[model samples]
Each structure stands twice: as C-alpha cells, then as structure tokens.
Target chain A: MHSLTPEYLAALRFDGTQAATLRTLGEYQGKQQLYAAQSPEALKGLRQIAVVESTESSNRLEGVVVAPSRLKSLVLRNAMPKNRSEQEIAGYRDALALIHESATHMPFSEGVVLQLHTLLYRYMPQAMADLTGRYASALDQHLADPLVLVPLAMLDFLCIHPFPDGNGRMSRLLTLLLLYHFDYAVGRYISLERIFEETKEGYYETLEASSQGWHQGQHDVKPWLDYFWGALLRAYREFEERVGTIERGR
Target chain B: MHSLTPEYLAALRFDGTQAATLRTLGEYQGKQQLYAAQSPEALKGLRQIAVVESTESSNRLEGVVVAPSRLKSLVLRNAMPKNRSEQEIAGYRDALALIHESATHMPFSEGVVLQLHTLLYRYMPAMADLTGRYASALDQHLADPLVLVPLAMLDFLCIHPFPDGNGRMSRLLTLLLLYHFDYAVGRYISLERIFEETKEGYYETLEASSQGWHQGQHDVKPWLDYFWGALLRAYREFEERVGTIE
Candidate 1:
C-alpha cells in the first residue's frame, strides 16, 4: 500500500473554505440534476458548446491552433483534418467525446490514465507507446475520496509530463473526465478551461508551488486542491447564474 | 516619407508561388459569383458556421472564451453578455456581422480601418483610444497591391493599433478586405481558423517580416508568403467543399 502523505490527508480535511465550496457545489449539483431532468433539450446546446470550448481552450494553452471552422468540423467529425495540428486536435476531440459519453462506466486507474493519454495522442503512435512505458506507477490503487484523489492524479500526471507535448491539455481533459465520474458536471455548463485560462497565472503558480518534492512522495497538495476547488466553485457559481438566465428564457 | 528597401521591394515581387496562388484563387473567385447566384440559400448554413468559427477562434486565440451556448446567442445577438469576456466576444461577433453586411461598401481607407478597429474594441472602452492611429506614413501607400494587403495587415499588427484585441480585429478585417476585393472564400471558410492552425509560422513570419517595418526597411516576403499560403488553403478548401456540393 502506498502511504498517504500528511499533506494529502490534510487536503482531504475540508476547512471553512473547502466546506463552503463543497456545500455550494453540492447545491449546484442538485440544480444541475434538476435542470437535466427538466430540460434535457437545453443540455444538448450546452454540451456542444462545452466540447468546443474545452477543446479550443485546452489546446490553445499548449499553443495549438486549428482553424475555428475546422475545429468545429473536426470535433463534430464532419471534416477530415489536413495537417498535424488538426490531427492532434482530432485526438483531443475523440478523447473528450469518449469521456463525455462513457466516463461513468470507466474506472480511474493508472492503466486508464495511460490509455486516455494514448488516446489523446492517437495520431502520434510512437509517442503514445513511449509515454506508456515512461509513466508507469505501482501506486495505482483506488482511493475513497474523489476530492483528494482527482487533484493528486492531476499532479502526478503533470509531474510525469508523459508526452512530448499536450501534457497540460491532456491533464485538463482528464480533470473533466474525473470530475464527471465524481458527479461534478459544472464543466458541462461553464468552460473549466476558460476558468483555468482566466486565472492562468495563479494556476501555474499553484501547480509550481504544490509540485515540489513530488517525485519522492513529499509534495504538498493543498495548493493544487485549493486551486482546483476554487476553480470548481467559480465554475459552479457561473453555471448557476447562467442557468438562472437560461431558466428564465425557457 | 519612409523609403522602401530593395529587400522589401523584392519580397513584394510575385514569382511562381504568388502567380499560382493568385491563379487558383482567381479561378475560385470566378466560381464564387456563380455559386452565390445559384445557391445563396444553401450557403447560409456555411456563412453562419464561418461566423461562429471565426468569432470563437479569433477570440479564443487571445484567451477569451464564453460558454459555447452563450457563444451562439452572443454571435446571433439573441442574448446579452454576462461578463467582460463575453462582452468582448459580443463585440467581435457584432463587428464581424457588420463587416459581412457592409464590406462591399466599405473602402480600404485610414478612416474605415480605424472604424473597424473601434468596433472591434467597442466593449472595452479603455483600449478603444488606440484605434485609428498609424505607426508610420509608409502605412499609407501600397508598394505592391498583390502582396500589399497582407503586408498592410502585418503592419497593423506590428503597430499594435489597439491596446488589446488587435489580432482578432486584424483577422476580421482581413476577411472583410478579402471579401471587398472579391475574394469571398472566407465567407464559406474561415481565415481566422487558418491563421491559428499555422500559428507558429504565422507568428514567426510576422516577426521576421515586421523587423525595421517602423522605419519602412522591412522585408514583406515572409508575411506575404504565409498570408498568401493561408489564402490559397482557404480557397482550396472552399473549392473542394463547393465542388462536393455541386
């Protein structure tokens, strides 16, 4: 059994901010469920928008750009890509589409993470095979708490830096998938990548601050957790406000 | 008056690559009128997609994002923006919509360029003051009309005419100016998306070509090659798609 670090245990312990964030997120979750039930039709538009925003925001962070028109066609699988960058985008689009469709059925594991990473770089066959070998971990055991595990998993992936490129974007795609698995679907409404992009400077700082001593199992995860939760809280808050408007329009 | 260097003049000289691009592009432009006349209704779907793609791709390049659902409403002007970012996106959408509506009447003048820039930053008042300001007088004259438009775009970018949103505005104007000059492929496809897909080359060529541009000593080849290449690709795509439809 891999020993859970003191920092990890502390991060799992929700204080005032975390507690309030969880309550608000829980309320948003409840609202999301009700909204889904009541307006299944409305969600179709939101889902399409989320996928495009998620793909564009995530890839653009890595300095990848596909023609905005081509991006839509690629994501929707309506057009074939004509270049390497578009091919890479197609990879992300496929991975994200799969996660949206089947996240609940898929269990989180080191294997699954690697598999998803493979899928993310599907066009780059050699890189996928190489990354699978490089980032193997024995501490692929399941955890009881998703709040703690999701951030930890993200950190481990970032620390690993599994591929030659698109590590940041792949991690974010995984973050959305894991959040979906954990039943936090605010990413479906508000663009999580947008939130990350907006607070991008702090995002890098928190990752840098929290990733120290990570390789030897001595990193502090509180910063990542705090940032992660803060992003979630902001997304949920925005989702609620937007949904309120959407509901009124309906 | 800023003097143009031999290097700048040579870059503007069209060789086989430029001739070929112009040839293929002219062929497409010839077809564009017939297609528009034949299937104006059929092209509506394509035009709408181009608008959304252009708006989203351009804004997102600057790290501006709105909810996808909000994007459709925002672009279509069916809804109100919820934040500063959305407001910026709304501004882009409105400006693009305006260009598509009135691009034929809008001439390539300092006044029109400034007006488009103003419309681009309409939501962000703080940055709007920078519009209509040119960095140099060489900005006024075209050394070579074929390569001139793309060179002018590069100078606009180098000038950093707006405090923010210059890239998106430049692209929107590129699309409109191309349309005004009878290059209508951008309506069916997206130049913003094309620039993004080749972003590394786009930025690199811009950097290489914009050096000494302020003093009018810059070479225009790198930017024009990249720009022409992008247009050729966009036209090729438009041709392929229309060929399929026909």
Candidate 2:
C-alpha cells in the first residue's frame, strides 16, 4: 500500500542532485569538526544569538507577541514572564534549552515526545497535561527513515495539537529536537524557525500538502521532505557565506 | 627556473582524486562555520580537549618531554615551568594561545612570523635571542607569494631563520597563517601528529622540496600534495568523530 513503512522509506530513490548534496554535506560535517576544536568563546556568543533569533521568530509566527525590550531578556534567561505571551516564550525557551543540552542522549520515543510538549507548556497555568505526549494510533505505522520520520513526526504533532494555544511553536521545537536526535544538526547552527518565518506562506503550504491523507496513510511525503531539505540547505548556504566573509577578512 | 610562482600554482593539474577532495573541502569549510555557531559550552569543552591533545602531540613530535600529569596544566595555564623542557612547553602553550586568540588579526608576514617565534621562546632568554630574524643570505627564493602558502612554508624551512626551535616555530607559524587564510584544519587536528605519523615521508618531502629552493628552482608539487593530503586526512578523522557526538 505505498504507505510510510520503514522498508518503503529506505527504498526512496537517491537522485543525482540528492547524491551530490549529501556528499557535499559530508565535507561540511568534516569542516565543523575543526570549528568545534577552536575558540569556544566565539561559539558561546553565537549560540546565544541563535537562541534569541529562534525564540523571537518562533513566537512571532503564532502571533504570541512579547515587547522588544522584554524579549531579549526573556530569551537570555535574564527576566521573568509577566503575561501569557511571555509565559509561552519562557516555556519554549526551557524546552529548547533542554533539547540543546540533552539532545545527544534523548531518544525519540513516545514518552519523550510527550515530555517535550509538557515542558513547552509548563509555564501556562492549567496546562493540558492530559493531552501532552499522546500520539495518534497511526504513529506505530510511521516509517523510521529520517526523511519519513521527521516530517511524519512534525505532521503528527500538529494534527494532535496537544497544547491548547502553542501547537505550532511546540511542533517546531519538537521538529528540531527530533532532527538532532537523528544527527541532523542544522537547527543548532542555522535557525530553522527563522527559515520558516522568512518563508511563512510556503511553510504553511507545504504543511498543508503533507497533512492531507496523513491519517489514511496515503499522503505524499515529498512536499514536506522537500521543504525540510530546502530549509536545511538554505541554512547551510548562509553559514558558508557568513564564514567565507569572516575568514576572508580584509 | 621552475620556481614556486603564483602562475605555477594556479596552473597545477588536479587529478580526479584531488578535484574530488577540493570539492569536499569547500563544503567542510561551510560546515565548520556552522560548528562555529554552536553553544560555547560545547565548543569550550572541545577546545580544551583539543588544546591538550595539540600541545602534547606537537611537543612529542620534537622529542620534547613533560610529565603526563603536568601536560593539562601547561595547556590550561594553570602551572608554571620548572625546567628547560617545561619552559619549552610553556612557550608553545603561549604561542598556541595567541594563535587561538588572535590568528584572525595576525597577518601572514615576516614580522608576524618573527613575533610568533619570539613568543614561542618568551621564557628562554637565551633562546629568545636566537629568533625574530630573517633567513641566511641563501634564501632569496623565500620571497614566494603568500597565495602559495604551503610552498612559502617550505621556503621558511629552507631559510631556517632561527638557530634553535626553527622547526617548531615554522610549524606554529604555519598553523597561524593557515588560520588567517581560512584553512583551519590544523587548529583542531594536530598537523604535528600527522607529521610524526609520517615521519619518514615528512623528512623526505621536506628535503626534496627544499633542494633547489635556494636558487628558486624547487619543484614544490611533492610537498604541496603531501600537505594537502595531511589536511584532508585530518578532516576525515574529525568528521567521523564529530558524527558520533552530534
């Protein structure tokens, strides 16, 4: 039945373009190893910048506005939340920080998924604790190929809408955490949320395309996969340019 | 004379394998920028680990010795030198720290090269006197272009600027210049270790590449290829290890 079976996903065709991109990505992976070995001082500062950009973009996506002055402090963990929007941002910051600190150890199990959602709303009074972590019965049928698993997990999270108000943000957070679990570190360096923010309309378009027939196991996963890969490649391209400029300083 | 000219380097042939490696290296360059963006906490931990490994391996390459227990202290700046060997290690630590902190601003020039050698012997008063000068009269070919950095590196060795610690200073200067030019593999993976591993080849290639260098007739292809291979090997090892962590 051409569904998202593990066997089916593993059998997906590797076209010439995909093959080249993957090989190029391997070299980039190698390059980062050198960066990892030098100057932790610079990296720490960059990571904080990424966090602020990520939190602001993700929160703004769902119209959860926090004041400009308060946003930076909240993202930097220097201030306390006073309103619903600020509270949601705080919850996401905690969840994202957890993923950053522990993604290497966190498994992509149903329980951990729920745990992330619960933390995403820990700041909300009267949170939907019951709905947190509950996946549709169809997840058992989902494939394990990261190409399949990443998008399926994302789509499933949105469909479930476990949280009362922060489903979109929660889904984005989980997508990044799950990608990290699979050894795709794109979001860590480049803000995946920012990419989605810049391409706001296309983001919803791809999500809508993949969400159809999802429950019946007939959805074409290509759109979401393409969207994800494009965002990743875009992030990497920008990284290359920025470093190239710095490294080739006058 | 078939000197190490810019045109000569630009026209050098890249076989299928070399072409493939260069293409891969471009992406690796991009990847490290991403790595540069990671949380300072992770990067800081990795940097310390690399510092110890780099200091130990580079020093061991020259038969310099210090107690294993004191190595980390030497690298982390937690201990002072108590002997000749310890002083040399301390010198390397300071020079390396400078490269780590300021390689971006330090241009590849004769002055900076001399300064690096000077810092490399800041503790040894007698040793410091022997450095910060140009090569003997025989190194006219040392005027090779900076674009041919690897070749210029070979000329520095041929020039043999200092009476002592020339080899160590040359390697240290190479690390700094490469960082300035953005070929940063040496910062993470110790080029000294790679040289030590291929000790025989390293010696042979250096001698061969430096042979006609005095008259600017050197065929730098052999050493350039060797250096490129070492860098690519480091990248591969780095990639494999980082995969397990990320």
Candidate 3:
C-alpha cells in the first residue's frame, strides 16, 4: 500500500528549500517505483521518445534540410545558457551521472534533478553558472498545483530561481519519462510540443506569473500554479481526443 | 487584394441523401455570408470582414474544430472539454452554421463537397435535408494570386465545410475552418482535432487522415490547392520553429 504521510507531504516545501521535497514526498517515494511500466499514460510517455525519434528520422528521410548547428542553436536558445562551455560541461556531466540516484517511486531527487539539467545542457556554455541548484521548495508550487508534478518538478528545479536550463524542456522531458515509466504511451499520438508552442504566450505568462513577485523578498505562488496546471489540462484534453479517434480508426 | 479561380480549391464531403459530388459540380463558389453570427470567431469573422481580418482573426483565435460531434463526445467522455457552456455558447452558434453550410471558397463544386459526410447523429435532425441547399458560392475571380485572396475570405468560405454545427466552440471552429481557407494554420500548428486531442497516437494512419483524403475519383484539384495554400511560407517557418522546440 502507499502511505503519503502528512509529514512527508509537508516535506515537499520544507525550509523554503527543496531538499526534502525532491528526496521525499509523494505516494511513490521509497515505494519500489510503483508507477514503473504501468498505466496507459505511462506507456504513452515512454513511446513518445521513440516517436520523437521517428519524427526526426522521418524528417531526415524526407530529405528535409536539417541544420545540426541550427538545432544546436535551438537547444541553446531553449536552455538560455549564461556561462562558458568547458566548466559548464563538467557540471552537466556530473549531473547526468547522477541519473540513477533518484527517489525511486518519485524518479527524482534534488541532486539527480539537478543532474538532468546538467546532462541536458551539458555541452552548452552556461551549464555550471546557470545551474540554479535545488531550492527549499518549488517557489511556484504554491501557485501551480495538479501540474503533473514530474514536469513541474523539472521546471521548478530549473527555473533561474530554482534549477537551470529554465527546466521547461527538462521538466517536459522528465514528465515524458515519468509518464513512460508509468506505461502511458500517448506521447507519440498527440503533440504536446505543438500545444506548448501554440500557447507559448500563455506558457510564459503563467511562468512569469508564478515566478514574479518572487524577488525583492516577496513571493506568491498561486498565479504560477494556476498557469502551470491549467496548461497541462489544456494539453491533456486536446491530445486525449485526438489519440482516441485514431485508436478507433474514426 | 487576393483572387480565386473557380477550379482550384478542395471540397468538403457531407454524407447524406442528396449530397453526392458528380451531380453538384457545375459552378464556382466563393465565401458564405452568414446573415448573422453567434460565436466569438464568427462574430470576429464578421467584424473583420476583410481578407486580412479573416486570416488574422484565425491566426489569433483557436482554428475551427474539424469534427465537433466526435470531439464533443471524446471531450465529454474524457471530461476534458475546455470551455463551459457560457464560454462556449457564443462559439457554438457559429460552429453550428459553418458545419451546416459549405463555405463558398471550398475548392470542390458544392455538390461534390456535400457528399462527404454522415450527417446529424445526435442533436439536430434536419442535417440531411439541409445539406442539399446548404452550399451556395459567391465572389469568384482569378486576377489576384491565391495568397492574395484575403485569408479571411478563404477561411470564412472554405473551412465552413457543412452548414450546421461547425462553428460552435472556439477551438473546433478554428480547426474546421483552418483545414481549408487558412491551410497554413493547420500545417504549421498541426492543429487537427485528432492530433491535438489524441495524446497517444499521431493519428497519422487513421480515419482522420483518411477523411482528409478524397473518394479517389475526381482529381483532388481543390485538395491540392488547399494543401499548397495551407503550406504557405509564413506558416511553414512557424511550424519549423515549433517543431524544433518540440
């Protein structure tokens, strides 16, 4: 059985830092990775990787011009790097090495979470300096709830005020990983990227709303949380139907 | 200013008794004039009234929803429809009309487009009879380039495939209309109802894609032009950028 104690749940925002939150909290912490290889959502998440791969491959197969450097530029731009490459690379590599060191049931911890950013933006120039490190709590958590925590965790960890690489993509990737780990395989069918891209204006607004008022010793989490989970729901509904029709061959 | 030739666009298929392609292929059509509109997009479409407004409004808002009844079923089933009745009420009115009346710029001759549907399963019962008189074309010209045809006019006339229930909700309304008049929006956004709704599959090989395909008889002149128009340069780059981010 899963036991999510109040103390454990409270640990999610302990000491205004994320130490306890990442390492603890949730029904899965120390619970043998309960969600692993289970649930349609999880399978879809896992399948998304291959789907993304297929898409990239198809683009290549179609003889479409794919400038690897342009891709690199996109990655860096997405990461919004801020430091030198060599030093940052080491930090990111160290973070990547920490992947296996996770919360098991949660699939993450503050350290390993940091590592994801390091690995994702490892080759970029600002990995080290941009690594925001773990916080006492996800500053925007109070603002955004029901945001599919996996992605929020990534975003919370990577925000300039939290982790690094802005955590948007990493959070998205981690969400995909967690969903896959849980056996959700809808990633390939519905384009989360498209949804996110389309609503980029709102996406940034929500992030900013959550992240705003965070500085100058003032912090409010509701706006960010409101934006965070709301976008998730929007995307969720959009894909759920698209995939369903395809499944039914209608 | 944009111009459209009679023979160059795609046709929408509505399934019903009088709705067959061969019998309906005599004249060229332009845009549909809704005597009045109820949805925000339709209202917006009405206010904009220019080619730019039509195109720009589509860009700003959610494109038409391709299959509303199916989408509504899925959304309600999954408990995922975004708008509440109050929020959706305005859009629903517009959607209902677009689906019932085949928009003018729809590439195929009116008769051909009307044959591609399975009409009114749940709510309104008059959908079948409505299909026969639903499509009427206006304003056909060839002097201006296809792109020159105000994105608004194209979207207004072409995307409104059927006369009923097409423009109800904002999102589906956008998708429904975008598949034609504003093809670029669909291509760049990958905003097909199926793609956006079904998170597990791309729906690439499904009835959605197949539905987009034709009956395999007449050359898909309309479809081809629609495809090319949708793949315009502006939308392609945006799609590429989005693709990278994704």
How would you order the candidates by lDDT, starting with the best?
1, 2, 3
Kindly indicate the candidate among 1 and 3 with the higher lDDT. Answer: 1
Return the top candidate by lDDT: 1
For model 2, the superposed segments whose C-alpha errors exceed 4 Å read: A1-3, A7-11, A39-41, A127-148, A162-165, A246-250, B1-246
List TM-scores of chain B, every candidate: 0.82, 0.80, 0.25
What CAPRI grade goes to candidate 1? Answer: incorrect
Specify the highest-DockQ model's number. Answer: 2
Compared with the true structure, what per-residue lDDT tens digits does model 1 show for residues B1-246?
112333443334443234334434544554565555556666878888888888888988888888888898888755777789887887888788888889999866667777887777677741222122212212443232334457556766776766676788778878776775567788788888888889899989989988887787776668878887898788677666554212
Q: Candidate 1, A131: how far from true, in Å?
A: 15
Q: Give the TM-score comparing model 3 with the true structure, all chains together.
A: 0.29
Ranking by DockQ: 2, 3, 1
Question: What local lDDT does model 2 show for residue A239?
Answer: 66
Q: Write the per-residue lDDT of candidate 3 for residues A1-250, one digit (tens) a residue.
A: 0001222223333111121122112111212122222234544543444344322332232232234444334323343333444233233323322322332343444554554665655655442222222221322332212222334343444354354233444455455445444333234444444455556677667666655543342434434444543444454454445444544552
lDDT of 1 by residue, A166-245 (tens): 78887898888778875777787678997898898878999998888876766666688789878988887776676667
- lDDT over C-alpha atoms for residue B30 of model 1: 46
Candidate with maximal TM-score: 2
Q: Candidate 2 residues B109-178, lDDT tens each?
A: 5677778888778878512221212121113322221224566567667767678887788678778767
